[PDB]
């Protein structure tokens, strides 16, 4: 509501732009900051995954598997 504090988990600065901000993993990141951990692709608005408190784009998430079926 009225009270509350903002913040960008990525850089740290507050996230505000007249209706701007990417919420993921119970956190807030800037459209730019919010990106993959492998290819570091712009995930501002797309399908991604969550592994080890990280962000992996569908593409990567699928690529990582190739590595090996064992251990998930
Ligand atoms: Zn940021
Ligand atoms: Zn990726």
UniProtKB/Swiss-Prot annotation:
Residues 8-45 form the LIM zinc-binding domain. The LIM zinc-binding domains mediate interaction with LPAR2 and with S.typhimurium protein sseI. This is Thyroid receptor-interacting protein 6. It comes from Homo sapiens (Human). It is found in: Cytoplasm, Cytoskeleton; Cell junction, Focal adhesion; Nucleus; Cytoplasm. Belongs to the zyxin/ajuba family. Abundantly expressed in kidney, liver and lung. Lower levels in heart, placenta and pancreas. Expressed in colonic epithelial cells. Up-regulated in colonic tumors. Relays signals from the cell surface to the nucleus to weaken adherens junction and promote actin cytoskeleton reorganization and cell invasiveness. Involved in lysophosphatidic acid-induced cell adhesion and migration. Acts as a transcriptional coactivator for NF-kappa-B and JUN, and mediates the transrepression of these transcription factors induced by glucocorticoid receptor. Specifically interacts with the ligand binding domain of the thyroid receptor (TR) in the presence of thyroid hormone. Interacts (via the third LIM domain and C-terminus) with PTPN13 (via the second PDZ domain). Interacts (via the second LIM domain or via the third LIM domain plus C-terminus) with PDLIM4 (via PDZ domain). Found in a complex with PTPN13 and PDLIM4. Interacts with SVIL isoform 2. Interacts with LPAR2 but not other LPA receptors. Interacts with PRKAA2. Interacts with MAGI1. Interacts with SCRIB. In case of infection, interacts with S.typhimurium protein sseI. The chain holds residues 279 to 337 of 476 of the full protein. Signal peptide: none annotated. The gene is TRIP6.
